[PDB]
DNA sequence: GCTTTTTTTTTTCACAATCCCGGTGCCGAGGCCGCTCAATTGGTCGTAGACAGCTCTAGCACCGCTTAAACGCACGTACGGAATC
């Protein structure tokens, strides 16, 4: 077989039929897709990384993240962001 | 047993995976057991607030499946995408339709 | 290795297709002065491109430049480009 | 015989090519163009197909963009030509050019 | 009755101030304005010393380098006296605003 | 008057100042208030971000470092403050 | 010490414990913070060499940023490797342009 | 007490009196040294965690440095960057 | 204030270009399958960092002098830009 190669297309199908149910995509637009998210997890990973480095911490945390999407998201796309984290990581802790 | 993480947060977008991504990606010695959980929230909502904003761009060109040239035209007409993409080139993406004033006949 | 020595291809960028980009970026008039001035730009942005490319490519030993390669490298110009992986 | 006035069909192409996203360079010239420049750097290369098409991408898009910078030059002088010094002042205040 | 024409004076002060190196903002000013500013993101900020002169040295340096380009916008319209639609068109082209 | 806009603060004088260190000869009349525009603009992103970091760091004093490191993100990387 | 053995003024030992601790790699060889410390040191050198100069050349013992701000910005090179870099108390290089000088 | 914050300064200084062993410094001058050395060995280290990351690789060699060096300084400058991290990595070799 | 033309406006068809549909056909989006290797479970151990307590740094407020800089106003020259060719 050929070697694996990850992708988060089944995620990205996975949302889009949330959205838009009656709604494809396109090999090459999947694959802007995916570009689109690496790009960003390397953008929020690194301003996280850059965070905890500079107030001497050896532990990238939650805190961290968000501090990061506000200093890289604009605006309302920021808050969005930040409630659906702060949502998400509520929900994970009470089901622990 | 086993309920996958992303499951229990309410998530689409894998934080297994994500929680590995980041020990691996030299970005800290630690990583904090949320920092995955709301990264993959975050990457998750910022994707579908793109296939939405697509998708209607879609349906407007009259088609069923989204194409570069609707996630461009969705990205650029959205003021915060595109400002959030703004050195960021999307292949086979196109331009908006833009004519300056002055060019135009009398 | 039968046969590879290159030409003059940057008269390959034809004053048609110099025309249909400036039509892209919504030009109406085009001065008899831009197309060769065009090319040197051109010229100058793939020899920064592919210089950036050849060397991921040297370092990773291969002969071959991937679409990983110029990737990698655009994203060094702050030219980040979607849709040919990474 | 009729014959449009001198505008009014770059106006047209300025609206086909606007609406559409195929590349706009003819795909052998570009890529026997790589192949020649790359030489300068390192012989008997070869290329993946979608690292050539990835930089056909990332050009016209380059140029695309700075054909824009540089009709804003050109109506920022009154004209309506781009002329070689819309280009360079262009460059000049993005800073790719000293 | 000793009058310099108009624009010698403005050179004199340019050759003064391309030789020198010291903040051209008065600090005190400066200082209300990044105090001003701060409160809109957090209230009852302290500020280190060097922070304000940091954002200060910041500032000028900016202003500075967009006034060269904006001269350069104003000559490339054939005229001597800069004006908003530079500073603007200048701002365009750097991708500052859209 | 004399009250409570800051920015007003930035005399002509000093924005004649810049324009000059800027080789700029002959100066509009509306400039000093787009330059007022610009200024601010400039400082909202830059301080917006250095409190970003303040608030994150858990302290009060707003530290030289905290805008350097915005500075470095908004691309305008500044030396000898302790870059 | 290590630093004597590779020639050199900057520290391979404080250079090589800045790359494991820094969030780069894994891993770190026992060339890379030698090569790190003699490109540092080199580009150093070359500043304080053209800086010193500039010193020098207003009778002055001691480099000030006015110093580094024109050596720096008179080396085509220099100047590119700091282009988006901003030298606090640099000032800016004498320059009128043409068409705005009399006659 | 007084924080304890280390500098690149001490070596500054023993370069300037290997170019200029008569001239001296300023401390906003020697601020700029070190927020110069800091920049680009940040900028080095970067883009060899990078080449080593885009490689599979685990270990920053002197040969990531080298590649990384070509990539970010230009061309003349390169060229004696290389010859002297090259000539310091022999000598140091050379000697144990 | 006219008489006589140019300038600008209007209306009438001719013609090209683009637009919109159904018909047709090919291929890649979509999805199912079977197997894998990476995410999960449940465990252990060590230390990163939260936390309370204390130190003393440097940020802030205030005040009272001495100017240097900002200010407002008079005046006119060189500039921007409209108009023509
Ligand atoms: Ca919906
Ligand atoms: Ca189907
Ligand atoms: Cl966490
Ligand atoms: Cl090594
Ligand atoms: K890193």
Redesign the pocket.
Known sequence: ?RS?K?SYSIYV?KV?KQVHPD????????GIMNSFVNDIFERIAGEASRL?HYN????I?S?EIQTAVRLLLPGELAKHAVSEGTKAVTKYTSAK | ????????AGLQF????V??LLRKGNY???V?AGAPVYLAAVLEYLTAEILELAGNAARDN?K??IIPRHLQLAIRNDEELNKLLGRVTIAQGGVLPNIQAVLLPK | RHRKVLRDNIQGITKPAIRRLARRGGVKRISGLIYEETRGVLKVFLENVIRDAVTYTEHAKRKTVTAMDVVYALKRQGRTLYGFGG | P?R?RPGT?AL?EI??YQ?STELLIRKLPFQRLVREIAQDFKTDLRFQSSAVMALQEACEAYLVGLFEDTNLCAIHA?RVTIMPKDIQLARRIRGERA
Do not use: C, D, F, Q
Request: positive net charge; hydrophobic residues 15%.
């Open positions: 077989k694996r990850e199908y889009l709604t494809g995509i396109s090999s090459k637009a999947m905890a001497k911490r050896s532990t945390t805190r | 047993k086993a309920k996958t993480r992303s499951s229990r894998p934080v297994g995976r929680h590995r800290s010695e630690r904090g009259k069923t499946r | 009729h449009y069909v047209r609206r086909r609406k009154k």
